[PDB]
Structure 1
Amino acid sequence: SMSVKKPKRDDSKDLALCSMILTEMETHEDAWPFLLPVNLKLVPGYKKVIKKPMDFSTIREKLSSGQYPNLETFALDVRLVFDNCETFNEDDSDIGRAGHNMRKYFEKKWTDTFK
């Protein structure tokens, strides 16, 4: 509350560390469905169904231009990528499997770097 604060957790390395995680996600062999925005002209149903599209290149641009206020807003966008994938793709598909794999990969790196 006013003039009453918990001890200050050091967040000075968060930007660099989120960048490193994102690099590891970009270079994963199963990243290909997620590297670029879904083409809304060429994929029927996507525009109407997926209210907030997100992809790794869009996260990289937001990160590089100070559009994440803190590490939690960064994790919310990475999770959005996988939530969108599960919304549009069957589990038993190459893309559906890719999204589960990448979400697992992310969640471990996130715990090990920050928790």
Structure 2
Amino acid sequence: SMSVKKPKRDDSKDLALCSMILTEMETHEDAWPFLLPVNLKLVPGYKKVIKKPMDFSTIREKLSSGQYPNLETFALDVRLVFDNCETFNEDDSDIGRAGHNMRKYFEKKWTDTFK
């Protein structure tokens, strides 16, 4: 509350550390469904169904331009990529499997770097 604060957690390296995670997600062999925005002209149904599209290149641009206020808003966009994927793709598809694989990969790096 006013003039009552928990001890200050050091967030000075968060930007660099999120950038490292994102580089590792970009270079994963199963990243290909997620590298670029889904083409809303060429994929019927995507625009109407997926209210907030997100992909690794859009996260990269937001990160590089100071559009994440803190490390939690970064994680929320990474999770959105995978949540969108599950909304539009069957679990038993190459893309559906890729999304589960990458969500796991992310959640481990997140826990090991920050928790």
TM-score scaled by length of structure 1: 1.00
Q: Matched residue of 2:34: which SS?
A: coil
Q: Distance in 2 between matches of 1:48 and 1:26?
A: 27
Q: Matched residue of 2:48: which SS?
A: helix
For residues 26-54 of structure 1, the C-alpha deviation after alignment (integer angstroms, 9 at most, x for no partner) is 00000000000000000000000000000
Matches within 5 A, 1:70-109: 70-109=70-109
1:7, CA displacement in angstroms? 0.1
Aligned residues: 115
1:112, CA displacement in angstroms? 0.1
What is aligned with 1:9? 9
What is aligned with 1:22? 22
1:6, CA displacement in angstroms? 0.1
1:113, CA displacement in angstroms? 0.0
What percentage of residue pairs aligned between the two structures are identical? 100
Moved over 6 A (4+): none
Gaps of 5+ in 2: none
Q: Distance in 2 between matches of 1:94 and 1:111?
A: 26
Q: Distance in 2 between matches of 1:70 and 1:19?
A: 13
CA RMSD of aligned residues (A): 0.1
Q: Distance in 2 between matches of 1:101 and 1:18?
A: 19
Q: Distance in 1 between matches of 2:2 and 2:59?
A: 35
Q: Distance in 2 between matches of 1:14 and 1:40?
A: 33
1:58, CA displacement in angstroms? 0.0
TM-score scaled by length of structure 2: 1.00
1:10, CA displacement in angstroms? 0.1
